[PDB]
Symmetry: D2
């Protein structure tokens, strides 16, 4: 039997040490009384869409922040990241004739797993930065001592963000007639800004053709579906935002539409797996180089006993050198046991380089290589490359080569997100041809 | 006051001399009791579409036979001519983002006007061939004496033809997924068969994009609208198929959706103008080089007193050398009097060459020249080039250079119809740009 | 192996004796060159709809003439019979929330099977009247000698009829906003004209609600689907109108969408079964009291080898006293052999009374009794009462008690057709509840 | 020239006195950097819908809290109030065939205007409670001293509320198939719970009929439009959430879709009118007994110079005894000057009784009387009764007879909201009949 708190009985990684247990309890509790970020019916809709992807009739586009922060909470940043998602989706949908399920790593992706539980600088040792939901980035005691009030600040930032995202998606910003205005200024001059300008003109032509045919009024051209997701890492936050569906009595984690378990917290006997095991959400698990096929099958027996094709997204993050060696054996076990999974590629988290400095780098070319290989590997085994899962930004920076080089990892910029979409689009077209 | 027979009181051109008045009366009368080819509501729908064209929001595609015959009455011929119309319409609709109203010169276009009321061959003089509805093409007394039973044979051929055309249009033949199968074999190798193959692939892409967006089920992609038209020349036939709309009590000529008056029978005080003056159909008038602006205005006062923009299609057939000289003055009068008309180009009937032999020729290049000039002239005067009106065939012949060289005029073949559509499509795109 | 003429090698019932074989051949042949009444894609659509009915997700409404005649060929009669079908369908569709497949016994139902191959009146013996497609109703040699020219007259009447029916169905007559105008004058005063007036007001309310919701423009409210059917009795006519689908190369009988075999011509080794065995149409077989379960299974092995749920409609005509005794054993065999069939009730042809006079009567109450029992019997066996199959008229007569009392059988009038629809509607609602 | 702060230069009512100007400035400013509650395109959509109502083609349903509080911030309360709105709208839309524009007094309606700037209890005098956005309800210094941090708490409650409302409206809660589940438990037994149960069954029938017709998939049956509104009273909050539309450069108050000015703050030369004068939102003005026709016209010259029919909602709150005397003269001036306005009835704020105690009462019967009279008055003058504007709750209380009896006014309960909707629905049906 499961309950929203049965995770507290399991061994657990990556949890911060709070100075005041009773204070923490009071905040968990204020938060239990706050409205949910999502409605359970919506999470069932995403499951429905997941089952399409899993059967080879759609593709999953998941993208957003490494880890959102309190210091960067603006409409502009939310809007520009959403623009990049719309761009990518429209490119894939059109070139490949393929529905694309849109999931933002947004409105709740605050917590960070870490290698080390603390950090040392010139003889001083303090608790590690675990994301703004837990503590602050600044190297000083007050910043680093976990503050449970941050749970609420993270909640508030999330309702503001999701509220605006919902409004963009339904209220006209995502209307296909706005296809041009989704290209960010940044993508000004490359051949790229121009490969998209043509695709966009085509879409204009498509829509002109439809009004000429008498289809100018379809709501499906004016709005789109948009879902949110984050790593369920801080189980305090998740529990508090876990609610029963009134219609079915079934528990959903209503902090977001989809939750996923990290590579460092996926212990079969651990708290994170216990938590997500009993919620009705569609969910994911990060699958890195350390996963063998036995563990994988056991993990699936726990997270998808009924072998439902809408339930479980396996997010493969191997590294461009390792994907070829490791993935196949994993696909083959799944095939052999007749399991229904959605396979996605996280081509970022297994390609980060951390130098003694503590400085992180990602070569964008490695990122493309892992993707290209993920598609190759699925081609060969007779299975479906279902999804992509990336960190990206609408901001005008270049973080990958080809706060985000230390505590966080480097995000794709808009140019890079687009080249990737074009690449994915061609491959998908070939798959379907 | 008007009635279905008030035309009989006017002077009249082009009517055959029947040997037995009472026999003719008996047939007119059997035919008055036969069901109508069209339903009055449909004719009102075409008016509606005509008013769109007239306001610059659609374009009229009218095409079919010179004059249908009893000897060529096959599903194959009807199907192939319809294919050519679908091709042309899809090209124009897509390249130009413009609804195209489809009217077939079909299911009733049997009667022929002639220069001369008789014909002489080696000292023998017989009544002229006026179409199979009246008499036969063969040079011999029995053939040439008007036979009123032919009124019925023409009716029967028309219900068979329209019935099949309706079935093609609504029952799946005109479904946009069939876009490739509308190219006739004939159009095998040119760059042309290939310019259309690409446009067709684009359309496939457009439709894939729409099912990816969730629009796979729209009835408007599965069926299309199709209307019929002929020259109301034989007023016996028209009268008999003229019926009252039960809903409104208003008279419609239900032999076809649209009727038109020829260049040789458009006398202001004549029978043809009297007939069409009192029916509710949308209608047309052939406007040739002999029309001045005064006569034109008077004609319009009679055929469209209420200045309704759905009522009246002016079908300009000037000749490629004369269109530039004559049309402008006509447009200007109309503009100056604030009349609502649909302007169309018949670029065929003013470009036929009849040599002493009696052999008729049309140079296709002249045909393109008159069209190109018709568009130019409208460009200059600030008015709308609304339509095209051609004779064409799906059969594998070449009759225009670039029975149909004697009694009839040479039709466009499929290749030629397509080049014309591409040309019209570019021009329309430019108009709208 | 099958061909359009392999029926000529089998023994055969109910065929007329023609005086001139070569004349007959010449007409079969003129007719082979005439366009088809329907397009093969349409017949595949009806199969599709049949498979819905068979699976319990729609209901079949088949209705029209006993046998059309040359003397009654008017738009008014076609229109009024169609009105009665629309009425019935709208009643069933709305009260029961059930799609209704509409099939007219129209545009080809000319031929009549007879008990006796001849008829005697005061010492004179002449060939029996077999419908106007074969010979005339008048008791005299010239009338009664089979005339193959009648094949063409029947064809011509059919294209005229179908052309008009297609126009009504698609061009606005069947638009749901016209729901009131479908009640015929006749149904003036009963409680009945009033039960329908209320249902119609409800429909108005439904449509107002939909335009208030923003659904005013759906093509599915403006037009409806309509199919034709007749007994394939005269195999000369059927063969000539049997054509290959260009797309698939498969033979379809294109005289009508659906064909059926009569109770007197369903010999397993006979010509009629041979003919329909090789066409792609959906088809039916009249199943009367003389059918046992063995014969039934054999018949199905022949007409639906692949056990396709769209293929075969079994039209049960038992008599109100016999339906209870005979039908169950037939259903049970089918169930036991896992066959897919569409079950329909013809509650007319097994309830006709023929007195020594030769005068035929049907008591309408018997008709309702057989239907009510057909539904009861399906209720009990766990199977689906799929359809109704009746003869009816929009004309203002009363032929059933509660030419059509001699050569033909008495048709339901409009009042009676409506009471039946209301009855069927309630029962269907109960089935689905 | 206007700017987001030009209101600060005008004289101003109802503003609280803050102890620390610089602290207040710091909070206004944190809030200026927070994302907006709504997107400007959405506000333009509401204008569009307002112009429909104004032209007599829709009706406005505005309903929600008197004044939201921090102590009642639960998903349950937001959900239940939304249920009551859906109920009311579905009743009106169906019975009357009339689109209903839905505006919630929600996600920002926190501030309260007051009669008196302070309050005295047993010799102690403190600043008056002005809503939780300003200060607390408790009678004590700390509560009553305006606290600018409350601006943020109100913002946070609003994004949480709107986010959930958006999710309900689009994500499946407002799907018309859920029509039954919108009736609150409360409305258990009356004839009323039953008048709605029948209307709901009808809707079920309507939808069954539409899937039978092939319309089961329309997005317009799955989701609905929902807008928010509040009195723009605290101009600090409004200014900070006033942003430029990126597309047009035009200023919108993005705290809500619609803003309105109270009866006590509508001074023509005042700050509130200055603020709303320069934003692009649709807006409203409370029109109470003190308004004459001169002032009204001047007010309209300021708030709708361009006389746009989407811009301005006049919310008439007269009292049931005064509506008859006062409204007509106001309508007549408007008619005479040819002004485009949306007329709505607030039948609550002019019917509150405040006894010496300070205890407020509303008799529900007075409320129905004012509405009924508002419709009568519009009937007589030839103008359109456009809207209703009420305070209501999904909670199981009875506050009107037939915190909310002191600081706030008594809200309609669910039973009462429904009786009102039924009443409005009948009247609207009669108007349209
Ligand atoms: Cl503490
Ligand atoms: Cl790290
Ligand atoms: Cl004669
Ligand atoms: Cl000539
Ligand atoms: Cl003979
Ligand atoms: Cl008989
Ligand atoms: Cl202070
Ligand atoms: Cl007060
Ligand atoms: Co990261
Ligand atoms: Co010609
Ligand atoms: Co019969
Ligand atoms: Co109030």
């Amino acid at each position: 039997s499961w309950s929203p708190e049965s995770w507290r009985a399991k061994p657990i990684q990556q949890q911060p040490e709070y100075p005041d247990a009773a204070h923490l309890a009071r905040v968990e509790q204020t938060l239990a009384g706050y409205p949910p970020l999502v409605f359970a019916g919506e999470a069932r809709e995403l499951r429905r869409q997941f089952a399409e992807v899993t059967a080879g009739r759609a593709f999953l586009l998941q993208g957003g922040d490494c880890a959102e922060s309190f210091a960067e909470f603006s409409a502009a940043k939310i809007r520009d990241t959403f623009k990049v998602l719309l761009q990518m989706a429209v490119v894939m949908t059109f070139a490949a004739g393929c529905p694309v399920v849109k999931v933002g790593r947004m409105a709740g992706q605050f917590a960070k797993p870490r290698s080390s539980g603390d950090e040392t600088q010139n003889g001083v040792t303090l608790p590690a930065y675990r994301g703004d939901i837990v503590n602050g980035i600044g190297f000083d005691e007050k910043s680093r001592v976990p503050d449970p009030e941050r749970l609420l600040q993270a909640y508030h930032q999330s309702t503001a963000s999701l509220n605006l995202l919902r409004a963009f998606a339904q209220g006209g910003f995502a209307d296909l007639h706005q296809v041009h205005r989704w290209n960010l200024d940044f993508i000004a001059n490359s051949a790229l800004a121009e490969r998209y300008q043509q695709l966009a003109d085509r879409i204009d032509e498509t829509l002109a053709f439809m009004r000429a045919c008498g289809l100018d009024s379809a709501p499906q051209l004016r709005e789109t579906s948009f879902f949110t997701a984050h790593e369920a890492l801080l189980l305090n936050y998740e529990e508090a935002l876990t609610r029963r569906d009134s219609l079915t009595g079934e528990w959903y984690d209503c902090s977001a539409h989809m939750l996923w378990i990290g590579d460092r917290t996926r212990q079969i006997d651990g708290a994170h797996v216990e938590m997500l095991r009993g919620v009705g959400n569609p969910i994911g698990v990060k699958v890195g180089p350390s996963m063998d096929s036995e563990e994988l099958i056991r993990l699936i027996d726990i997270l998808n006993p009924d072998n439902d094709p809408g339930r479980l997204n396996l997010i493969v993050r191997m590294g461009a050198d390792k994907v070829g060696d490791h993935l196949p054996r994993l696909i083959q076990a799944i095939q052999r046991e007749g399991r229904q999974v959605l396979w996605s590629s996280d081509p970022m988290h297994g390609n980060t380089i951390k130098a003694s400095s503590g400085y992180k780098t990602r070569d964008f070319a490695r990122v493309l290589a892992e993707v290209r290989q993920f598609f190759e590997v699925h081609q060969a085994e007779g299975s479906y490359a279902g999804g992509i899962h990336i960190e990206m930004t609408g901001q005008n920076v270049t973080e990958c080569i080809g706060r985000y080089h230390t505590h966080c990892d480097p995000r794709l910029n808009a140019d890079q997100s687009l080249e990737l979409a074009f690449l994915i689009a061609e491959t998908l077209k070939q798959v379907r041809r």
